[PDB]
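Minimal example, chain plus flavin mononucleotide.
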Amino acid sequence: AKKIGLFYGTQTGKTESVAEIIRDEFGNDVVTLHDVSQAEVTDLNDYQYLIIGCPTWNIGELQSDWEGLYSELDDVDFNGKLVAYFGTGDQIGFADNFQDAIGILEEKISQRGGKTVGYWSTDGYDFNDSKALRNGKFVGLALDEDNQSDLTDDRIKSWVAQLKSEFGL
Ligand SMILES: Cc1cc2nc3c(=O)[nH]c(=O)nc-3n(C[C@H](O)[C@H](O)[C@H](O)COP(=O)(O)O)c2cc1C
């Protein structure tokens, strides 16, 4: 009815499109979408299950709107919440900072108490470095519409089935 809050930020809409797919994969009224460009850090307190969507830009930078909300995280609490992350990036043009955005967001949110779920395998990706890594895996679903648009849909399906399990749905 109302359990998972998906807060996303997007520059050219790729991340938003993925967010809508994620929503449809979860089932009737489970997930609600929220453009962080119109959100206050306190909106995240209304959910015990969160999905953070954010593309990486300008070589390792958080998407514009997320950058603004990011600064307010240090004053909020995420303890007791399960948080998953996903983002669009470009492993070819920016192999050294692939998906840094979700890595940055995850570090901060986990630091504030959020427990991360939804770890994703790096197998099948071609990149050099990322701030979104932990124990050999991405801290969230890594999508690449610029180079692997053909893999996004099945990657989302797999990830949602994984989260349905990890969220205990
Ligand atoms: C100037 C510029 C810088 C970019 N930098 C990065 C980067 O550092 N890391 C990454 O993974 N992708 C990077 N990208 C690729 C975007 O993340 C990718 O195209 C993404 O799908 C955009 O999603 P959005 O439309 O949701 O903003 C960059 C793209 C441009 C045009």
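The longest strand covers residues 82-88. Residues 121 and 137 are 5 Å apart (CA to CA).
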